[PDB]
Design a binder for this molecule. Structure first.
Ligand SMILES: CCN1CCN(C(=O)N[C@@H](C(=O)N[C@H](C(=O)O)[C@@H]2N=C(C(=O)O)[C@@H](C)CS2)c2ccc(O)cc2)C(=O)C1=O
Length: 509
């Protein structure tokens, strides 16, 4: 006598509130004993029709396997259409109860959640990451044959399978939906080719939403683009441009060489460093103060400061806030990125670092860096499961240096000539826009037709609760600046995010 393994019930995956994101539904599998089927050949065409198979090819198969002990007829029928075949009473055919995954939210959380293969085994996303947790231990039942090789059902020897454990994600489904809508809208409005949006609780390190475009339906995956399956927020890296200037500025303030009211001469909006040149886009002034360097996004201005304080001070801050650093999440295919070191930093590499080039980070890392800045310089570890206690973070930027930079970032949103489209009705919002040329397809240089539109920020400025990053690849029909393309998305999603968490408005009306 032999065994057939009976599969375990895979553990439920939910959002932070209990909304189901991946549930295992019962499905029927039918197998047969050819030694018995060959005695009821008259019933084969009826059976084959009930299985939706060709009557001849079905017969061909049962014939070739006549001497065999055990064969599958079909895997993964519904419980209704499955027991339809059982009701035909055909001798030699039996049922097994199996499980198949279903994803209620579909493409909205597909990238995060991932999916299981045909055998209900985790293969992408959280399904793969927490596969041990979610799987459980399968059982088994013994099949009992008699004197003539017929199997009997009246008696059953069974070891019950142990069901998998429930997993509550950090993601808020209500907030994911909102984030997914707006990123899709922005991507279609601007004719963009890809995008990512990350929402994080700055206090708990929880990822409240993480969505990407293009996406896919994990319930129907026939013919699928590899590009559509990428969780770009964790799997793809980019040079973050001027969105890392507040960290350069943090290093400046902490060095004791600079104060907010210092002025810097940025004339004529260019700075030649040997065989290469630094350029300011808005060459509208000769002199800017520190806040003005962020507002007008002066690459020349921040470069001069970097020469004064040195790259070592800048590199440390960026490293402490998590840029180019392991997140500790353990997501499948997740990228650490690259924050380089040189022993002795030349001026060119010192400058480009100061305004966010030469380093590569993920959206989740950028959002994590802004969360520390938002949480009074107190970096807290990332989590994609529901957090039951506010964890021990690390004070990476000084509480005072943080408040200053918080104030400065609030100005780039609210001050004149600032990123006014990032403003949130009823809330004081802080953040920084960015526009960056994409790196050349396998060459030293950069593209000049392809841009990445960035906006990173947090709100409310009076007591930051959540931080957000928006990234849009290759906008192509309605401008391309970050404060034009990414900022409106930030504004839209942040507005909804805050009210959904019942955050009190601090900027009336
Ligand atoms: C090391 C070599 N290398 C890499 C490429 N490279 C870059 O791509 N630079 C970018 C660049 O500075 N963008 C700025 C930024 O980051 O914030 C500003 N963003 C804005 C925004 O609203 O968000 C604006 C206000 C306008 S501008 C830029 C320049 C020209 C453009 O036609 C568009 C964007 C460099 O500078 C550079 O030297």
């Amino acid at each position: 006598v032999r065994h057939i393994a009976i599969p375990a019930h895979r553990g439920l995956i939910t959002d932070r509130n209990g909304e189901p994101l991946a549930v295992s539904t019962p499905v029927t599998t039918l197998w047969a004993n050819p030694k018995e089927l060959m005695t009821a050949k008259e019933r084969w065409p009826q059976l084959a029709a009930a299985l939706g198979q060709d009557t001849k090819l079905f017969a061909d198969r049962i014939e070739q396997n006549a001497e065999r002990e055990f064969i599958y007829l079909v895997r993964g029928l519904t419980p209704e259409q499955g027991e339809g075949v059982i009701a035909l009473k055909v001798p030699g055919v039996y049922s097994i109860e199996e499980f198949r995954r279903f994803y209620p939210a579909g493409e909205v959380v597909a990238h995060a959640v991932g999916f299981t293969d045909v055998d209900d085994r985790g293969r992408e996303g959280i399904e793969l990451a927490f596969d041990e947790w979610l799987a459980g231990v399968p059982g088994k039942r013994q099949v009992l044959k008699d004197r003539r090789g017929r199997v009997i059902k009246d008696v059953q020897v069974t070891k019950n399978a142990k069901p998998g454990k429930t997993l509550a994600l950090s993601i808020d489904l209500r907030l994911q939906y909102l984030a997914h809508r707006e990123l899709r809208n922005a991507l279609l409005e601007n004719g963009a080719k890809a995008g990512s949006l990350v929402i994080m609780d700055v206090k708990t390190g929880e990822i409240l939403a993480m969505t990407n475009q293009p996406t896919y339906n994990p319930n129907n995956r026939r013919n699928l683009q590899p590009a559509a399956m990428r969780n770009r927020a964790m799997i793809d890296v980019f040079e973050p441009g001027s969105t890392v200037k507040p960290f350069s500025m943090s290093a400046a303030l902490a060095s004791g060489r600079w104060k907010p009211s210092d002025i810097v001469d940025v004339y004529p909006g260019t700075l030649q460093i040997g065989r290469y040149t630094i350029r300011d886009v808005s060459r509208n002034s000769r002199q800017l103060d520190l806040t003005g360097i962020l507002i007008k996004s002066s690459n020349v201005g921040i470069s001069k400061i970097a020469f004064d304080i040195g790259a070592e001070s800048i590199y440390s801050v960026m490293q402490q806030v998590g840029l180019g650093q392991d997140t500790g999440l353990g997501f499948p295919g997740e990228r650490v990125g690259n924050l380089p070191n040189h022993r002795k930093w030349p001026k060119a590499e010192t400058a480009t670092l100061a305004y966010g080039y030469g380093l590569s980070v993920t959206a989740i890392q950028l959002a994590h860096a802004y969360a520390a800045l938002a949480n009074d310089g107190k970096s807290v570890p990332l989590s994609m499961t529901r957090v039951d206690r506010v964890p021990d973070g690390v004070q990476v930027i000084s509480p005072e240096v943080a408040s200053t930079v918080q104030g400065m970032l609030q100005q780039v949103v609210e001050a004149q000539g600032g990123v006014f489209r990032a403003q949130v009705p009823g809330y004081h919002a802080a953040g920084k826009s960015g526009t960056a040329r994409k790196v050349s397809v396998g060459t030293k240089g950069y593209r000049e037709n392809a841009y990445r539109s960035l906006f990173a920020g947090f709100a409310p400025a009076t007591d930051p609760r959540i931080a957000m990053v928006v990234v849009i690849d290759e906008p192509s029909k309605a401008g391309y600046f970050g404060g034009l393309v990414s900022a409106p998305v930030f504004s839209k999603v942040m507005a909804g995010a805050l009210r959904l968490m019942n955050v009190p408005p601090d900027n009336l009306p």
